[PDB]
Design an enzyme around this catalytic site. Structure first.
Site, mmCIF file in Angstrom:
data_model
loop_
_atom_site.group_PDB
_atom_site.id
_atom_site.type_symbol
_atom_site.label_atom_id
_atom_site.label_comp_id
_atom_site.label_asym_id
_atom_site.label_seq_id
_atom_site.Cartn_x
_atom_site.Cartn_y
_atom_site.Cartn_z
ATOM 1 C CD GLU A 162 -9.010 -2.656 -1.732
ATOM 2 O OE1 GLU A 162 -8.211 -3.494 -2.211
ATOM 3 O OE2 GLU A 162 -9.780 -2.916 -0.780
ATOM 4 C CG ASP A 211 -1.815 -1.252 1.249
ATOM 5 O OD1 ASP A 211 -2.379 -1.620 0.201
ATOM 6 O OD2 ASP A 211 -1.927 -1.864 2.338
#
Ligand SMILES: [Ca+2]
Ligand SMILES: [Ca+2]
Lengths: 511, 512
Positions: free
Chosen positions: B181, B15
């Site tokens: 997302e 991420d």
């Protein structure tokens, strides 16, 4: 400080050592490897660096047809009145007629004003009666050559180019097998005679004797053997063939050869050079490590610690070959280059595969660990059957393990073993064109090869779970005196073509 | 003038969120149950990265002691505006928790600082549990916004970014791929560009985009979607998505994103890592990544001055502060580890719980960054009762690890134990001598072996496995597998409660 034996790891048998001032120099035998007789330097007796070789010119010594583990045997270095001397036996393939006489060995003498050389062209002393010549100069300045069997003393002329008189065996040894590596040491009003006995296998030992006279008689040391390995479970074995030195601070030390059995009685990296202190006794003798045998960890010599650059990564951007490299037999200087393409070690493909004694320009360095990886970046364009280049773990012409980019109905990554004369393809994978990376991964007796196109993602090419044939004992060769080396090679599979295999770099990683 | 090979930040670094400030680049990655939380890295050339700190370093700021495996701190977002560095991240709770009267399974954390490395403020919780992956966005009028999943849901924030100040609007729903997302917004050339991670962080991972002339839309989808994904199942880089865009000081555009390296099968051994690829703007007002070729294996380097860093692969533990490449599994117990009680040594006092227990304290581990490596320690430890142990561990989770320890078990033993999806098995047990000891883990793809030595020269096999595939996101079989295999040290008393010092002289990581 402490150190762990061996201090000079990898293929470094038959150590002979001297001290000149603050500098220590050591020679080890090289057998079929070229340049012959490796010369190493140290300031602290623990950390050693290769600084040269005794015989560097092909005109000085022709090993091109010398059999595996024949050639240059135990060397002896000495220094006297500004001259460095090196003697060594040259072991021929078999009975050879030289100037009317039949010999299987010759003694070599080279000398120089500098420890690293360049040394004089080899002079042959054709006394074929024994091995392991050792230079001794008596207090009157007369020169002598010790030679096996046991301590056989030959007088030499001043130039040390010939024997000047009849030999005398001044000490026969203790009755153990193969008394060899004779040395003489003069101290405390005694002549001390030193021998390697038991053979260089697992009965190797060091025994001594003393006399008040050069020619004897010699009485045996009551502490014999003053060095040997009595513990069969110890990780260091085959301890013998020692050489003594006194430091500038008055400590006495001995270097000696040994072996590290690798998952059984397999001296994978070959005989190595270990270190242990010499203790003089109040009854006129000396022993090594208090008769405890070889140490695994030991108090360091009282000398300032000086480490060296190990040159584990060679980017090949110097026009001279690094001193850690050896050629298998004499190089073919027409077919290798560091200057045709700066930044690359170029091997032009020779005509013979590694199993042939005629194979040229296999360039290898010593394995110093049982856990290591070795990798290259290779630029090579084979276009016909058998043309190949890559890396190799090499013990002899009958024992090696190679991984190469090869043309075999297209580009392939190929892994091949020669297991005591039996060739077997362990793996063969499709290869893409262009620059290529190859990696050997060694974990004890398990060895595997991987290839990559960008040096990040590695794919298995092949390997073996039993590399014990790469060792003195596992080789099953008639003589196994060297050690497994790792490096590069190229040949044309018999096509005849001269193709350029360009190695950008070689990288050795102990893990 | 150079090339690089992905990933550029190897090992457990999922991420990624990146910013440029001047000539410097700063990046954060999620850390889940590891502490300190939110790893912060720095680079000058976008290729070579070094850890410079963490977002959350004090135990009072975030309690992970009971947080489940792969819960905790998820995708972080770093941003810089008017001299303040902001970091947002979802904190994933173990399950439904009532907080100030309300049912949440996630909280959003905001921390801020005037320096990239911190120290950051104590976490402030924005208790909006409707989605994950908060992303800070400042419009041209200076108003602050928080983007959050599902897809691009836009929340307005107060000026201090400590609370939500209005109703959310989903400005773009995505492309219909699952788990939309990691929303980001980029304002450029009169467009608002909406960026999403879609397909899930598994092997369908991708990056999709959309644009609009207005903040609140409507957004039209990019005709080049997906602008990043791995379509070749045979490629050594997979799971490509969750990108973050940056413009360099020379006007180049680059994207960092997460990816996985499958290790002899679909096994992301070292966890998701951070890759890099160029961003190309198109003449019809869009941008793509690596010309829609998917992740690169070798790529032209950014037009930036090359700056490499000291990697700290050998740690002799002679600083009084712990190196920044180390992480604790959950919060440290500061009373039971020390770099100052015996200078030159990392001391672990044996804690009360073994590694399979969430309660285990002071497992100290660093990231695996290669599939071929060894890790070794020199250890001074004197266990005298049953279960007292210390050694090295390859650690994925409480249910998935491989440990090799000096242990007292009817005398001194070298013991190798695997926990494979919760099932524990002793792989080897050798008689051990007293005194200082050397332990070595040797990793070769999915083969892993442990060795011991009494002087560092002669190594003896303690035990190992031919199939370490359980040390991976996919092989763990954990409810969530978001981290990555780590390697490090541990000590415990097996539950006796006794306190014995385990003194590690050094830790040595060697890529081969
Ligand atoms: Ca080069
Ligand atoms: Ca230390």
């Amino acid at each position: 400080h402490t150190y762990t034996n061996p201090v000079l790891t990898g293929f470094h048998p038959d150590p002979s050592i001297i001290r000149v001032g603050e500098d220590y120099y050591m020679v080890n035998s090289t057998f079929q490897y070229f340049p012959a007789i490796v010369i190493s330097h140290s300031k602290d007796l623990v950390h050693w660096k290769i600084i040269g070789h005794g015989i560097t010119e092909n005109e000085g010594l022709d090993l091109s047809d010398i059999n595996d583990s024949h050639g240059i045997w135990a060397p002896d270095i000495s220094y006297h009145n500004g001259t460095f001397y090196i003697f060594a036996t040259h072991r021929l393939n078999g009975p050879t007629v030289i100037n009317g006489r039949k010999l299987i060995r010759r003694q070599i003498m080279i000398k120089s004003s500098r420890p690293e050389g360049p040394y004089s062209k080899p002079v042959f002393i054709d006394e074929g009666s024994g091995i392991d010549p050792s230079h001794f100069v008596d207090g009157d300045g007369k020169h002598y050559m010790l030679l096996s069997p046991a301590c056989t003393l030959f007088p030499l002329n001043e130039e040390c180019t010939d024997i000047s008189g009849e030999p005398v065996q001044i000490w026969e040894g203790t009755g153990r097998r193969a008394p060899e590596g004779p040395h003489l040491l003069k101290k405390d009003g005694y002549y001390y005679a030193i021998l390697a006995e038991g053979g260089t296998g697992y009965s190797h030992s060091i025994t001594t004797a003393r006399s008040t006279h050069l020619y004897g008689p010699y009485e045996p040391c009551p502490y014999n053997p003053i060095l040997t390995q009595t513990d069969p479970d110890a990780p260091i074995q085959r301890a013998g063939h020692g050489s003594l030195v006194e430091t500038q601070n008055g400590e006495w030390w001995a270097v000696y050869l040994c072996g590290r059995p690798n998952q059984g009685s397999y001296t994978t990296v070959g005989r190595e050079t270990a270190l242990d202190p010499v203790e003089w006794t109040d009854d006129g003798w000396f022993v090594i490590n208090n008769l405890k045998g070889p140490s695994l960890v030991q108090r360091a010599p009282n000398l300032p610690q000086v480490k060296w650059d190990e040159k584990n990564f060679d980017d090949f951007d110097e026009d001279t070959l690094g001193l850690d490299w050896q050629f298998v037999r004499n190089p073919d200087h027409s077919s290798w280059s560091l200057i045709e393409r700066p930044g690359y070690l170029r091997l032009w493909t020779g005509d013979w595969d590694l199993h042939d004694i005629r194979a040229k320009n296999t360039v290898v360095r010593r394995e110093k660990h049982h856990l290591y990886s070795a990798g290259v970046k290779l630029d090579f364009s084979p276009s016909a059957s058998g043309e190949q280049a890559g890396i190799v773990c090499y013990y002899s012409t009958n024992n090696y393990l190679k991984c190469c980019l090869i043309y075999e109905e297209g580009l392939k990554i190929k892994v091949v073993e020669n297991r005591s004369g039996c060739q077997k393809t362990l793996g063969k994978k499709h290869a893409e064109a262009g620059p290529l990376f190859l990696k050997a991964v060694i974990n004890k007796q398990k060895r595997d090869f991987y290839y990559s196109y960008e040096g990040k993602h590695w794919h298995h090419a092949g390997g073996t779970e039993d590399a014990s044939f790469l060792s003195d004992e596992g080789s099953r060769d008639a003589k196994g005196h060297t050690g497994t080396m790792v490096g590069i090679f190229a040949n044309n599979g018999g096509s005849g073509r001269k193709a350029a295999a360009d190695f950008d770099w070689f990288r050795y990683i102990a893990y």
